[PDB]
Amino acid sequence: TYRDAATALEHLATYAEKDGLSVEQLMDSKTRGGLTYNDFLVLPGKIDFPSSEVVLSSRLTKKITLNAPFVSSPMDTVTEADMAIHMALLGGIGIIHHNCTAEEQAEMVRRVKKYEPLASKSTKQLLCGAAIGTIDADRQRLAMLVEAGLDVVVLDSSQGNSVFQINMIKWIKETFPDLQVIAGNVVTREQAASLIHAGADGLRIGMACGRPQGTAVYNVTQFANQFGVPCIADGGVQNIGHITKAIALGASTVMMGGMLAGTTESPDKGSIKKYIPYLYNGLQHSCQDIGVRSLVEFREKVDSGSVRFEFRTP
Amino acid sequence: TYRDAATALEHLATYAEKDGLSVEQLMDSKTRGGLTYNDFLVLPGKIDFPSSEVVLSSRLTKKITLNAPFVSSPMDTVTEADMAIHMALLGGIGIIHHNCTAEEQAEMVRRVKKYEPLASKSTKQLLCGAAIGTIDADRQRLAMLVEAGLDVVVLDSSQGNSVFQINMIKWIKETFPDLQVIAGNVVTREQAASLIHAGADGLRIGMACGRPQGTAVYNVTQFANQFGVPCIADGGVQNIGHITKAIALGASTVMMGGMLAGTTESPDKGSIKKYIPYLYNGLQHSCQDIGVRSLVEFREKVDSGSVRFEFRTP
Amino acid sequence: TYRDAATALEHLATYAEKDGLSVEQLMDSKTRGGLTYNDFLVLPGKIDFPSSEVVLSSRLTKKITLNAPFVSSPMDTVTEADMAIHMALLGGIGIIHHNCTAEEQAEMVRRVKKYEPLASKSTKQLLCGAAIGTIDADRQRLAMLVEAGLDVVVLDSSQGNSVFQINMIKWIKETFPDLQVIAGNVVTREQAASLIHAGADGLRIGMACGRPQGTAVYNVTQFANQFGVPCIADGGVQNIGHITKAIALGASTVMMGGMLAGTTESPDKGSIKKYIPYLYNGLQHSCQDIGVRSLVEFREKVDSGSVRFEFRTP
Amino acid sequence: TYRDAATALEHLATYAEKDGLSVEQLMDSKTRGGLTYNDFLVLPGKIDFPSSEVVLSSRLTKKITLNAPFVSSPMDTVTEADMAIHMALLGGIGIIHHNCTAEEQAEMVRRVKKYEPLASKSTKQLLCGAAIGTIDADRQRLAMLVEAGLDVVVLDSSQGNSVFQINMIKWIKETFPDLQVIAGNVVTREQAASLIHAGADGLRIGMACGRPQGTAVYNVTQFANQFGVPCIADGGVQNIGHITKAIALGASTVMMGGMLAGTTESPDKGSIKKYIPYLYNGLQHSCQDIGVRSLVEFREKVDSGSVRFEFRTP
Hints:
Chains A, B, C, D: This is Inosine-5'-monophosphate dehydrogenase. By secondary structure, chain A is of the alpha/beta class.
């Protein structure tokens, strides 16, 4: 009559595929269309370890790795020296905004770099990022930032795939060889190809014209990750769920803007000194539930079709 | 011109399939995606009997059968001795919560078991269930519950497919052979396989990480029912419609939480002594409309493709 | 360069099919799922006549034809003698409700039948319908209604495909051969087959258990219309758009409940003497826009794939 | 290990198609159904020029080309001589409404034509359009409008594919050979074929009976543009996004109604003298982001599958 319980693990082989969808099946522009994080769930797996064991090391750029995938956005309502210092102490990084004079921006970088476990350090000084535009003036700005000790620059554009930005990337790589460059914003595979070819060390993802973020992250990273170019998901995550899903779909780090506005160190959500640990633990538990011991493993399992997904009805 | 009325039953054969969808067609993760109960309807069939004839006997675990598929959730706002006693008198069962000391929980079980037609009885005493965690302490807790006469234990976890829970299942089966074990929570076929292999007598279904309940119930039970492992649908049903659909998709019993908060016997919806009969009759009428004389028949008809469904637009 | 304007009608042949969807393509339970009237639009065609020319004659049952497809529902808030008289004068019909004693119901019928162009007449007296249940008592009720001059009886059930209703149909046909019987409610092809086989002269369409109305109307009528059994759409139309779409999908007449509550003749929307003409003209204009000169033509064009449809996003 | 950055542009060839959907893939009535502008996004491309270089010249009719695709609707709340004069000065055109006597309408045209860079001019006088019906009286009306200097007439109908309108088109072409005729409204390929065959110089797109605008625009223009018959999108655009998408899908110009109600020159949104430049620049930037240097190029790129799209979930 009924099947033997002892055969339950073996009986999974009478099925053509694993329960749920692979990421490739989920992210089908032809059938499901463009997806946001709220449009799907990640299915749980097997828990064989405590969440405390989960490693969250994350590539920010080709040469920079953080102990956590959290990056503060270059918004004048979010990141200044205070934010950048405290994000780095907590294992992420801060991208200092450029709605300020070049001198003011360099002094903020200098404050971070002069500041004295999970901590993001270069020099042994705290890591610092900063945003610039691709206007002629930003060349002088960048030179000042580099003089102040900048580790990574983010080129700040709604539409990054431009001759202006490509030229800026090429100039930076030639002029400041030790500086890591994150280009963007991009939402398509073609945009990604163009800026990778130009010499980008990382990409920033998000945008009549635009693209649903989940679909953007998947299609850009599916291409970029083949070139070892890590991507930042910058679509305005609001919670641990959004962060887990951004990474699931291919992002290496996640940019936090509105999420961090209102915290103590922003220029009330309280202190980042509590909030980032809360997110860090939340992401450890997400990985635990999914059955992966690191974000590197998480990426590998998803790309192999081991991690499964389900599309959600409205 | 027009076809003869006398040929109407025979003309149904010029059609390739029955009107509406089979459950397999409905629950397609590739086309429709993940479904909740509100996303579909069960199509009516042929009424050849009064609703009063409908039998609602339901398997709780491999060895325990109830006269009705109603199970009270182990929530400190829902089930205590009062609830558990009255659920059992009405042909269902109550799972006593464990947000309390082990001694307090055992005394609540003892109250149920010492209490003196559709009634759920073991000993001739009322059936009682209780929830525990899978922490080391819960081993001592369970021993106390068993001493008090416990018939079935529910392992209480958001994500039940863990080494901790698997170990707990194996220990219980070896230590308390006469005790029935319901494992969970699970939402996937793989999770179900793992806990069935470990020795579960039943599964509890429901859950960044999770799954729409209709899809969860279908895919877990489609696997579990082959092993004679009955599943409890625990996604928070709110009405008779939800209960009918949970069972349609494969659930053997349904867990009621919020539905029963506010009733007289919970620790105003009035008395369960009225409400459960109301639900019992409602489910009889649902079965009647669908054209099935029992929940066993209902399961068989659905799995054979006889019972039909329709997906609902928003 | 550009194509000649003179060839525009001929160039439509380089296309594999007409623009938009056929009704069969629209009403696909596998792809689109279950549809309501709000989920689609009828595409316009070619206007070659004034709307005043549009004929709205509609089959109520195998033997009864009305000058307009409007039927008042058997609700004690909608149809009594006043409503039924005035609906018949305007070319539709009224189904008198049965939330009343059999004597009271017969007197209401008698009032209609004794009352002295588009007018619905049998005898030369106004046509009258009435609802009954399928309980033993309704046999005596029906005998009284028939004595009072009843032309058509509607069997009033949420789920009409029952042994009780089948028995009632067979008894009526044998006992009152001149009486037309509308059976229901049904939502599926199988239910329709059963009640047609029993001897129904018409079907009433609409209903955990149920079906989206557009899909119900299409699938029931696609079957029933082959047997010359006209169907009433009873899903609670609210406007001219709903009425046009119900008929487009296969309904022969449309039942109005809530639409007519609040009018002067119901037991403020004003007088039916104004409202029905307003709907009558609205439906003429709908037919005009679609390019059909009658509801008979409308049915034929839709079933041949000439009339086209478009599914609407939310 | 990782792929070389230098190969990034070449690696795009291992993919079967470009990222995102072609317009033909997007506008599938069978899979996605009927779409509105809010249901999709246009994907960004490569920026190789400043937005100021973007040319927005747009065909209004076979013989009339405007410097911008903006047309004011013939609504008595939107277009009169003031509106029409100022729209023409800004490189678009105004269609004067006909909820007025024929004499009053002709005097409004006369005011435009007698008025003394991007400016729309015929004679060297400002271009003027006007709406008429297809009633017998409108023949005398049109003669008066033509005497006043009318350049283009719009036949004003909810459903333009009628013998009345076809007759009117043929009469106009024969009687006033120098007058350009825009026929409509149409929403289908068949309606378009009929009015093109009759002699229309342009079509106006938009409409129980109707069609989602994005789908209407695509299917009508995909046919009409082959005959060099430019189409006006008249579905009530509200913003720059709507305007960009209407043109993306095939429209040559866009009609603005509600958008322009409340402006200074309508019979507060301020002056059109500011608002139209704002829209003009917005559309230049949209084209820039997409990577096209003109609306002619935009049409060509979209029809070739170069410009890509993404369907948006709710």
